[PDB]
Amino acid sequence: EEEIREAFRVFDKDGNGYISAAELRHVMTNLGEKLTDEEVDEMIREADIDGDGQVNYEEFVQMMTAK
C-alpha cells in the first residue's frame, strides 16, 4: 500500500493534500490514455464518496482498495 500512499503525493502538485480535477488531469494524461474533462471529472465523481468532488486520503484508500 506504499505506492498508493506515495501516489497521493505524486498526484498532488500544489501540495494541499488533495487531488483536484486539474491535478488529476496532469496525472491521468501523462499516463497515456488522455480522456476528456468530463471523463476525468467522472473519474473523481465515482472516486468521491464524502460528496466533495475531490478524492481525499480515505476516499483514495477505499476506492482503490475495495473489499
Binding site: 505506492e3 505524486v10 491521468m28 501523462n30 499516463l31 497515456g32 480522456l35 476506492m63 482503490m64
Partner: peptide, 19 residues
Amino acid sequence: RAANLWPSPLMIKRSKKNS
C-alpha cells in the same frame, strides 16, 4: 467509467518503482 484508470497511474507508480 474510467475508475480503472485511477489504478492505472497507481500501477504506474509500482512500475516506476521497478523502473
